[PDB]
């Protein structure tokens, strides 16, 4: 086992006369992938069994 | 002031220095009204102008008050049989009788693109907005900005009178987002965007003179960044979808955006360099090169 | 010792700048002294500049100015009227509950809490109540407990019909999450309103 | 059992918020509860956005109340303190008592780390032991606080990208797995990975170097870049040095020193700042001044 249209439709700090509330971003934030290894439990130990049999 | 400019230019025999000084002041104080493509369609082409006006306005155009068109717009019979011919028969006016019709044309452009509407109605609305752009263009732009709202049941910013709109033209690019697939409304919004960009340039140039009672480089950088942001938004609008490529509203909208970008590059050759230094996705590379 | 009209007219050329500056103590004092001036300068002056001033104060960075503007808005809605702010202040406050920031959402929740006791019960049933009901699925753990406290506060204000129809099921749904603070707040709200 | 204890905690917090210290048995029970609570936390506390990270308080209850009035109330918004709230202050026991009360009451709404002053050899030479001996009469509250300070976590990981810690980087540490495999239940020594994690300082040195304090090293920009690139981090938050604006960026926006103690030692007269991080990892530096007494 193991871009700007949306930023424009909600801009101007809802006032159209001042700057933004925040002061910028640090990196990217809210990492998209966030994937966890959940392939399978069964039929995984049998591959290890076949590999050990080949090695034997 | 534009109606007065037109009615003063119409009198060239008398009013010698008055019209000259008025135009010399309009060309300096209001550069957003001296756009050539705004009031160039009123030139003669082949003499066919006013012919249909003199030959198709006697039996009609006499009992078509704005209230009738207004009540014909909003009704349970949303069929486009009567409103079509009504809005078509009044296209022969001299662009001076459409002032009471401008209020009825506005505030309904957002309701127009609801669902299942024909193509000729949008074309007639665009032609009416174009012939109404030659007179009182500022109020028309304000009304069209206030009419094209997201309509999300919540009021965030309303009526954009003259200050919150001329300071940042980008508001004309945060509309209902349904006009992106609408060539006539997209062209109207592009005209308004160009006009408001010029108006913002003039407003900043006038504001840097009424202060401190360096700043010029800051104003130049702000204007360059604003033009670059507008170009980037117009380029991102050209994206196909959110998930035929030749025969669709997307093609016409991309062509109109490329035309506006070509006009902007002809006006200022530095914003093109700034945008290319900023960059844009590659999916727009074969479109801008072959379109501009 | 000075007439209200005189002190309100003398502070006009200065409130256009002292209302928004670097420090916040001056802003706090201006917000605290405003309710003695907005009721004397009429209503046109309010919708002219004071509405924008309060809407800008409600989104300030610090929390003291935010709570001061909240209390000032409460005082203004108690002094002027109920149906007057139904179409001028309530929609603008409810439209702020759509930002990705949790601070503005907490501010709107505090405003709903402070206005639920002045605006009666008919408006807080179908205008301000659906917002608090829909802001329960917020993944931010610092907004769910605020929504639960807001429901607890508006409990005694609203009738038993609304508390039994939609408040009880949404409270039962909120009591079955993984966090402990929101769960304790919801259990306290259930045990104080005798709904469970 | 739980409701009465919660109400007692609220009463203790409301009493502490009025410049009123607790009794011996109350402080003992609070320290015990904090010991059973902080035992489950690891060395690198996984903090989730949005938060509002602060810096040093150095035992300033009035400045802490000013910070709470500026950066939102404690139960409402999250807080991340990076140590130094026990020494060099007239009201030092009240600050740490309020902090530990908020921690045991809002364990998922506030996080506190360990600083160089949270020890047994530093509190005896800076006045905290003297304050505990003068106020409570005996020297048992100080013993309880020093026994509890060993359970405080070392660092914090905000959104898997921001790495908050009191001191700074370490030459014997190359990844967060080494920090997670440290025994924090130990007095801060004069040398080692924990001493450097609690006594480091950034500079334009480049590489390493002995610090003028007496403990910990001094890293440069290349070391910060290597540490941020080898751990998937994008920023390193710290609070160990005195600044003027409140926040200071170093090493090409890689290290952020956040000193949230206004008027340090009542002689500098500087400002203070905190960093509020929103849900989308957007940072806002909220500054403030010492409140008038
Ligand atoms: Mn320190
Ligand atoms: Mn320190």
Three-state secondary structure string covering B46-98 = CCCCCHHHHHCCCCCCCCCCHHHHHHHHCCCCCCCCHHHHHHHHCCCCCCCCC
Gyration radius from chain A CA atoms: 25
Residues in chain D: 293
**Tokens representing D42?**
């690891």
Ligand of minimum distance to the alpha carbon of D83: 2
C-alpha–C-alpha distance, residues A41 and B208, integer Å: 70
**D116 annotated binding-site participant:** yes
HSE, CB side, 13 Å, CA atoms: give it for residue B12. 4
- The crossing angle, in degrees rounded to 10, of helices D93-105 and D61-70 is 40
Ligand 2 centre to CA of D239 (Å) is 7
- Point out residues after which chain A has a gap (C–N over 2.5 Å): 2
Distance, CA of D22 to CA of D85 (rounded, Å)? 18
Give the Cα separation of B223 and B229 in Å (integer). Answer: 10
Query: Which are the catalytic amino acids of D?
Result: 117
Q: Are D82 and D165 in contact (CB under 8 A)?
A: yes
Which tokens go with A20?
Answer: 């933004």
Structure token pair of residue B163 = 């200050």
SS3 state of residue B249: helix
Distance CA D253, CA D234 (A): 9
Cβ–Cβ under 8 Å, residues D263 and D290 = yes
D21 CA to centre of ligand 1 in angstroms: 23
Q: Do residue A14 and residue C99 have CB atoms under 8 angstroms apart? A: yes
Least Cα distance to B113 among B140, B137, B82, B78 occurs for B78
Count of beta carbons in the 10 Å neighbourhood of residue B41 = 13
Q: Which chains contact A through at least 3 pairs of Cβ atoms less than 8 Å apart? A: B, C, D
Q: Which of D91, D71, D89, D69 is nearest to D80 (CA)?
A: D71
Q: Which two tokens stand for residue D240?
A: 């160990």
CA distances from C61 to C24, C101, D288 (A): 10, 12, 11
What DSSP designation does C41 have?
S
| Gap between the Cα atoms of B178 and D87, Å rounded | 61
Rounded CA-CA distance B53/B49 in Å is: 8
d(CA A55, CA D92): 66
Q: Cβ of B171 and A9 within 8 Å?
A: no
Chain C from 29 to 48: CB within 8 A of any D CB = none
Give residue D120 CA to ligand 1 midpoint distance, Å.
Answer: 15
Residues 6+ apart with CB under 8 A from C143: C102, C105, C106, C109, C135
Chain C nearest CA to D148, separation (Å):
24
Burial of C42 from C-beta contacts in 10 A (0-12 / 13-18 / 19+): exposed
Contact yes or no for B125/B133 (Cβ under 8 A): no
Tokens of B89: 């028969």
**What does each C-alpha distance from B124 to B83, B105, B185, B211, B248 come to in angstroms?**
11, 11, 11, 45, 19
Neighbouring-strand partners of residue D93? none
Contact A22 D284 (CB under 8 A): yes
8 A C-beta contact, residue B42 and residue B127: no
Torsion of CA D247, D250, D253, D257, to 10 degrees: -30
> What DSSP element (H or E) covers B216?
helix B216-237
Q: Which two tokens stand for residue B215?
A: 């700043």
Q: What's the CA gap between A27 and A35, in Å, rounded?
A: 20
Reading the block at residue B202, the tokens are: 């003039």
C-interface mutation test, from D72, D78, D292, most C Cβ less than 10 A away = D72
- Contact present, B and D (at least 3 Cβ pairs less than 8 Å): no
Note the Cα B161 to chain centre separation in Å. 16
- Residue D219's beta-bridge partner residues? D202
Distance CA D56, CA B150 (A): 47
**Looking at residue D291, what DSSP letter applies?**
P
Of D127, D104, D93, nearest to D19 (Cα)? D93
**Residue A32 near chain C (CB below 8 Å):** no
Phi, psi of B44 (to 5 degrees): -70, 145
**Could you count the other beta carbons within 10 Å of the beta carbon of residue D184?**
19
Element (H, E) at D47: strand D44-47
Q: Tell me which residue has tokens 């609408």.
A: B182
- Measured in Å, residue B262 CA sits from the centre of ligand 2 at 59
Q: How far is A38 from chain C (nearest CA, A)?
A: 22
Nearest-CA distance A37 → chain B (Å): 27
Q: Give the total residue count for chain A.
A: 56
Q: Report the SS3 class of residue C85.
A: coil
| C-chain residues near A21 (CB < 8 A) | 59, 61, 101
Cα within 13 Å of Cα(A54), Cβ side: 6
Comparing CA positions, the residue from B131, B137, B136 lying closest to residue B49 is: B131
- According to DSSP, the residues that pair with B38 across neighbouring strands are none
| Contact criterion met (CB below 8 Å) for B158 and B146 | yes
Q: What phi, psi does B265 have (nearest 5°)?
A: -70, -35
Tokens of D271: 């400002």
Query: Looking at the partner chain, which of D78, D286, D288 has a beta carbon nearest the beta carbon of C142?
Result: D78
- With the CA atoms of C109, C111, C113 and C116 taken in that order, what torsion angle do they form, in degrees rounded to the nearest 10? -130
Q: Which of D47, D49, D69 should be substituted to probe chain C, the one whose Cβ sees the most C Cβ atoms within 10 Å?
A: D69
d(CA D166, CA D146): 18
- Residue pair B261/B228 in contact (Cβ under 8 Å)? The answer is no
Strand-by-strand arrangement of the D155-158 sheet: D44-47, D155-158, D162-165, D235-238, D255-258, D247-250
- The CA distances from residue D199 to B45, D26, D96, D239, in Å, are 83, 32, 20, 10
Handedness of CA B189, B194, B195, B201 (dihedral sign): positive
Q: How far is the CA of D166 from the centre of ligand 2 (A)?
A: 6
Which distant-in-sequence residues (6+ apart) come within 8 Å of B117 by Cβ?
B80
What is the token pair recorded at A28? Answer: 């990217």
Cα dihedral value B51, B53, B56, B59, nearest 10: -140
Q: Which of residues 161-200 of B touch A (CB under 8 A)?
A: 163-165, 167-168, 170-171, 173-174, 177
Coil, helix or strand for B18?
A: helix
Which domains, and CATH codes, for chain D? 1-288 (3.60.21.10)
**Contacts across the A-C interface (CB distance below 8 Å):** 13
Give the separation between CA B157 and CA B175, rounded to whole angstroms: 12
D240 is in an annotated binding site: yes
Among B23, B239, B20, B3, residue whose Cα is nearest residue B140: B3
Give dist(CA C85, CA C78) in Å, integer: 10
Return d(Cα D213, Cα D225) in angstroms, integer.
24
Angstrom resolution of this structure: 3.5
Q: Which ligand ends up closest to the CA of D238?
A: 2
Q: DSSP assignment, residue D266?
A: G
CA distance B247 to B259: 18
Measured distance CA(D104)–CA(D30) in Å, rounded: 8
Of D31, D22, D19, whose CA–CA distance to D59 is shortest? D19
Q: How many CB atoms lie within 10 A of CB B168?
A: 17
* CB atoms C101 and D70 under 8 Å: no
C43/C22 Cα distance (integer angstroms): 28
Helix ranges (DSSP H) in C1-128: 4-10, 12-18, 25-33, 35-38, 44-45, 51-57, 63-79, 90-94, 102-115, 123-126
- Rg of chain C over all Cα atoms, to the nearest angstrom: 18
B156 touches chain C (CB under 8 A): yes
Identify whether the C-beta of residue B90 lies closer than 8 Å to the C-beta of residue B105: no
Q: Is the alpha carbon torsion for B45, B51, B52, B57 positive or negative?
A: positive
Query: D163 near D233, Cβ under 8 Å?
Result: yes
* D191 membership: H or E segment, kind and range: none
- The closest alpha carbon to B182, from B109, B243, B267, belongs to B109
Q: What's the sign of the alpha-carbon dihedral B25, B31, B37, B39?
A: negative
Rounded Cα–Cα distance for residues D203 and D255 (Å): 10
CB contact under 8 A, C56 and A21: no
Distance from the Cα of residue D188 to its chain's centroid: 15
Q: What residues are paired with D163 via a beta bridge?
A: D157, D236
A32 and chain D: CB distance < 8 Å anywhere?
no
**If DSSP codes are grouped into helix, strand and coil, which group holds residue D147?**
helix
- DSSP lists the bridge partners of residue D237 as D164, D256
Contacts of B210 (CB under 8 A, 6+ apart): none
Helix/strand/coil for B127: helix
Q: What is the rounded distance in angstroms from the CA atom of residue C179 to the CA atom of residue C185?
A: 11
Beta strand D247-250 pairing with D255-258: antiparallel
D224 vs D17, D71, D153, D179, D203, CA distance in Å? 39, 29, 22, 16, 10
What is the CA angle D135-D138-D140, rounded to 5?
Answer: 105
């Amino acid at each position: 086992g193991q871009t700007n249209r949306r930023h424009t439709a909600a801009v101007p700090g809802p006032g159209g006369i001042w700057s933004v509330f925040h002061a910028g971003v640090i990196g990217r934030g809210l990492k998209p992938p966030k994937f966890v290894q959940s392939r399978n439990q069964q039929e995984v130990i049998y591959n290890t069994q076949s590999l050990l049999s080949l090695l034997v | 002031i534009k109606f007065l400019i037109r009615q003063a230019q119409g009198l060239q025999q008398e009013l010698g220095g008055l019209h000259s000084a008025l135009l010399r002041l309009l060309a300096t104080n209001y550069p957003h009204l001296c756009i050539v493509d705004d009031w160039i369609c009123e030139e003669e082409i082949t003499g066919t102008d006013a012919l249909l006006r003199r030959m198709l306005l006697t039996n009609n155009a006499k009992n078509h008050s704005p209230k009738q068109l207004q009540e014909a717009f909003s009704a349970v019979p949303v069929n486009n049989t009567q409103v079509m011919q009504i809005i078509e028969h009044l296209t022969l006016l001299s662009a001076s009788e459409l002032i009471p019709y401008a209020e009825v044309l506005t505030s309904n452009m957002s309701q127009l693109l609801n669902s299942g509407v024909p193509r000729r109605i949008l074309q007639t609305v665009n032609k009416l907005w174009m012939v109404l752009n030659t007179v009182m263009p500022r109020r028309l732009w304000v009304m069209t900005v206030n009419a094209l709202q997201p309509s999300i049941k919540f009021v965030r910013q309303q009526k954009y009178t003259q200050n919150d709109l001329m300071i940042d033209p980008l508001i004309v690019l945060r509309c209902d987002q349904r006009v992106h697939r609408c060539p006539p409304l997209m062209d109207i919004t592009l005209h308004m965007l160009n006009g408001y960009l010029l108006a913002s340039k003039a407003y900043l140039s006038a504001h840097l003179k009424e202060t401190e009672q360096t700043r010029e480089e800051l104003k130049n950088a702000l204007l360059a960044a604003q033009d670059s942001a507008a170009v980037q938004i117009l380029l991102e609008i050209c994206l196909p979808t959110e998930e035929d490529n030749l025969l669709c509203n997307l093609r016409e909208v991309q062509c109109l955006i490329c035309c506006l970008l070509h006009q902007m590059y002809i006006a200022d050759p530095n914003i093109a360099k700034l945008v290319h230094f900023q960059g844009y996705p590659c999916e727009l590379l074969p479109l801008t090169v072959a379109g501009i | 010792v000075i007439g209200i009209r005189q002190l309100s007219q003398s502070l006009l050329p200065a409130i256009v700048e002292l209302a928004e500056d670097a420090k916040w103590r001056v802003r706090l004092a201006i917000i605290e002294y405003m309710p003695l001036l907005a009721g004397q300068l009429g209503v046109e002056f309010f919708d002219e500049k004071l509405n924008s001033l309060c809407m800008a104060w409600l989104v300030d960075h610090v929390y003291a100015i935010r709570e001061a503007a909240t209390s000032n808005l409460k005082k203004l809605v108690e002094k002027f009227g109920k149906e007057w702010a139904h179409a001028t202040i309530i929609p603008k406050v409810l439209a702020m509950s759509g930002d990705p920031n949790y601070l503005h959402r907490m501010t709107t929740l505090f405003c709903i809490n402070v206005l639920s006791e002045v605006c009666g019960q008919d408006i807080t049933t179908k205008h301000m109540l659906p917002t608090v009901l829909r802001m329960a699925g917020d993944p931010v753990a610092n907004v769910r407990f605020n929504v639960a406290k807001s429901l607890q506060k508006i409990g005694p204000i609203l009738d038993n019909s609304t508390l039994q129809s939609e408040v009880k099921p949404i409270l039962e749904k909120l009591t079955q999450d993984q966090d402990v603070d929101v769960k304790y707040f919801a259990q306290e709200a259930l045990t104080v309103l005798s709904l469970a | 059992d739980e409701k009465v204890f919660t109400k007692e905690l609220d009463q203790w917090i409301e009493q502490l918020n009025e410049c009123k210290q607790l009794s011996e048995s109350q402080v003992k029970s609070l320290c015990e509860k904090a010991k059973e609570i902080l035992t489950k936390e690891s060395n690198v506390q996984e903090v989730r956005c949005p938060v509002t990270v602060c810096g040093d308080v150095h035992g300033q209850f009035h400045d802490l109340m000013e910070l709470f009035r500026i950066g939102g109330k404690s139960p409402d918004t999250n807080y991340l303190f990076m140590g130094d709230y026990v020494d060099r202050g007239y009201y030092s026991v009240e600050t740490v008592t309020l902090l530990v009360a908020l921690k045991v009451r809002y364990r998922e709404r506030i996080t506190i780390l360990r600083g160089n002053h949270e020890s047994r050899q530093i509190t005896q030479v800076y006045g905290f032991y003297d304050e505990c001996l003068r106020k409570y009469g005996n020297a048992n509250v100080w013993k309880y606080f020093t026994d509890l300070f060993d359970y405080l976590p070392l660092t914090a990981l905000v959104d898997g990208q921001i790495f908050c810690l009191h001191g700074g980087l370490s030459p014997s540490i190359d990844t967060l797995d080494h920090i997670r495999a440290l025994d924090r239940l130990q007095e801060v020594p004069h040398e080692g990975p924990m001493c450097d994690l609690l006594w480091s300082d950034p500079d334009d040195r480049g590489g390493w170097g002995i610090s003028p304090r007496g403990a910990g090293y001094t890293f440069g920009q290349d070391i910060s870049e290597t540490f941020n690139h080898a751990n998937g981090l994008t920023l390193v938050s710290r609070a160990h040095q005195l600044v003027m604006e409140g926040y200071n960026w170093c090493h090409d926006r890689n290290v952020v020193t956040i000193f949230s103690a206004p008027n340090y030692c009542y002689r500098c007269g500087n400002q203070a700042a905190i960093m509020e991080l929103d849900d989308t990892l957007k940072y806002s530096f909220l500054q403030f001044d010492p409140a008038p007494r």
